[model samples]
Target: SCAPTSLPASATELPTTVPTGTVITGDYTGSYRPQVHYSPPKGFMNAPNGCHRDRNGTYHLYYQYNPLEYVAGNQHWGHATSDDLYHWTNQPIAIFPPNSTSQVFSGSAVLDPNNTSGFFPNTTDGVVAVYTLNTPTLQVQEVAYSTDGGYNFTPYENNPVLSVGSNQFRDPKVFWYEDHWVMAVAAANDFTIEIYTSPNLTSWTFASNFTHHGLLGLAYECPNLVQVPFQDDPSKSAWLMYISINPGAPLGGSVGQYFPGDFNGTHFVAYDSAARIADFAKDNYASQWFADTENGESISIAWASNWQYTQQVPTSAQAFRSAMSLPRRNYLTNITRLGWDLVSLPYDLSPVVGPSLLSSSEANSTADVDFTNVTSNAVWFSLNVTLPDAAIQNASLISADASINITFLPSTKCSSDSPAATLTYFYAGLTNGALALTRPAASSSWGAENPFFTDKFSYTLVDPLTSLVGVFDRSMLEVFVNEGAHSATMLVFPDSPVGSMKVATGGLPEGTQVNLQVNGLESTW
Candidate 1:
């Protein structure tokens, strides 16, 4: 449980190679390029990591980046900066892997002011990045230092500061708790998140283990622990832990799930019997919370793609594979019976929502609603399709880009040769629960390795949705339900820009009175 008290200092600073990343400059119209989300100009990316605001108030977001290929490998700390989380400017690779065999995997960064780590003894804005040094056979926890505001990092001379002699130990999220630093790391395959504490940043001692508190899925990775103060009462607060699991979401593939619990400096106690999934869709994974934020705020972002289909998602050919989810502000409130439950709403889109393209209210009927010229909301990238629910009934938003269906179940059937990546949300009778996503057919070459790829994939809902809001880029669809109480993010690749769109109410009892807004967004691109 103890590492050598003597900490290792960086001996040599690693070099960064300029990536041939996809460039979106003047009048650039690359395929499926996200307008609002953060994505390097080129290559593969997964997981949002080590995001922290610097002393100068610049927000840094580091992610899993593969500078050379469009597939996941060649892992390096891909860096980007933003004044606000939405408008990101890709920076150079922050932490390049030491060699060809070993790579820099997911981890977090901490700003040391009091010089807790001693790596930044005399500096005011010293940053210590704690991450996993991964290779085919071994994965060990390593530390690197950044003296210049995290623009560059030099790995500690005495590496592998903490190693369990196994590949299962990875994704260390370090934070300042009380006085000293506390690390919540993933004992991945063991399905546990081990807590470690340090008087200084280098040496660590195991404090406790949080094992099997939520729905046990597959290999767990990217363990992030953060504090969320209730908006109503600043006095009451809770710690939220994000556990990323792969090949194992009920909806199929990898997704980020969280447990709202109490952390007494060392140990985290899960308040719920089951972990609440951050998103029902497979795309959101390895999400992380930033190191520093405003007085009372908890904002986080996720890699907007799933492991199962990342390499194969149609956007891969664009030289860039995935995008980061828009930063969302999280709140812990007592209004929801699940007090420990966290509610997340996207940062206000008034800055780029543009204008209302389409709006309609209908009753007791399945009527078609349509519109054009939509692409933006999360940074003015694409479409912000809002479907307000008032006495909600059966609703489906359809486009060549994707199809979304929301139905209160126990009745009706609608099928067709109509196919183009579909996402379905249903409430079984009044007893509503669960969400489903499906690819219409085996037409495309992608999604083959995944059995659930072309077939239907769904997950049980912790709480049924009361309403929904959806943000659609050319290749991304983020569903926000109940004012963002629950959300599901999915990736879709239409052969072309929105060929058409149809939003309608169907399958509800004929006499049932309805007061719902119909939504239809067609990309006029």
Candidate 2:
């Protein structure tokens, strides 16, 4: 393959709106909002890079930002800071491509100790940033310093603090060890985490490499190495190394992989061979963590949209498709049925609310989630249903009219050999007591690819009416089958006209009893 070429000069200039003519538009959805939740911005934002929290409680986050309208070039570190994760304030382009450099790529941050004597004396060794700078000859990890609590930075004259051995070394994550600074860079075919050590944050010494031998994924991007408490026992400690990969099929070419192992300051030792590698979410990418100095808890954020399908949703629409899941505090739990389940802290969404009982009867079924007793649109709610055995064998029909019948001749059951499950949901056109659509669960050629868009992927078939439960957000939706045994994430765009959730059923006998509840959010942003 040819070397990746830089964008044209004209393409480097910032445009008012994203240009759709290019191969891919850089403007996609992301978590650049001032609040706790994420919102869509004008341009591209891939990884949560150069992240750190200062002593004064101000959090600084910089990401891979491309200013060019439709093209990915003129890459600079887009910066922002916030006292709280919510309410962020944008800073001017903190790190721009130097005149001689091609682009400013991903990297990490560290707080330089002032007492260290080997470094510059006049400069206030407060915060230091190390990043990848792609020059014509090579891609080198560069160093920059900040004084006034991360306001400004001055790059070292020597610049390339770490050599880009094969031009494939990038996305440096730095951390402070015993008496030295440690860094890890993502390697290509080498399949190893290249470790480096520095005393003054400027001069680095190449260290050993922990080899994984290449089958994990394509090239690893945005690798983060952190020591977190053991999921089961907080007293014991474990190391987690996370990597972002391209060509992730479900998201059309992007996904994140994590490895839970043991780190003795330099390299990682995997605890369980098979369970060591896991992907947090099918749609999550470029997730990075910040050392929680205050709470002693680990908090992580990632770019939600994948690489290829970043701009699939129209920008002209009132809503954007980008979002960063709420900062989840990680822990492990043994689910009732699912072996080891990764759970997340609930995100505070008290703004949007709806009714107490959102009934979607035959006459007023489909996307007709009631909002009579509801207060805001951001309320947390759950739906439960009983699938009569007869309904399990029927065709698809609208929740209101029960016209759409579901095809369930082929039973989906959960087993050691095959653990596939089936589920269903309701949708509406425009009017109440009008034509409503009830889509039933079915297997697809691309199984589980589209959680809702295509069909459901569960093995246990619900007949004669079993049960259904749903949890959703403005841009994301999740359907739980039989409590929490089986569920799937459904990406929805219920912005204006489509912003309704009515319930219905198909292929079942009449007089089936279904119940649901709209719960108030326990927290707020």
Over 4 Å off, model 2: 1-36, 115-125, 213-215, 231-233, 248-252, 275-281, 316-321, 332-343, 346-379, 382-473, 477-498, 502-525
How far residue 150's Cα lies from its native spot in candidate 2, in Å, is 2.1
Error of 2 at 500 (Å): 2.7
Candidate 1, which ten residues in sequence have the lowest lDDT sum? 407-416
Maximum-lDDT candidate: 1
lDDT of candidates 1 onward, in order = 0.66, 0.52
CA RMSD per model (angstroms): 9.9, 11.4
What digit string (tens of lDDT, one per residue) describes model 2 on residues 372-423? Answer: 1222223344544444445444423324433222211111111011212222
lDDT of 2 at 115: 34
lDDT of 1: 0.66
- RMSD (CA, Å), candidate 2 to true, equals 11.4
TM-score for each of the candidates: 0.79, 0.67
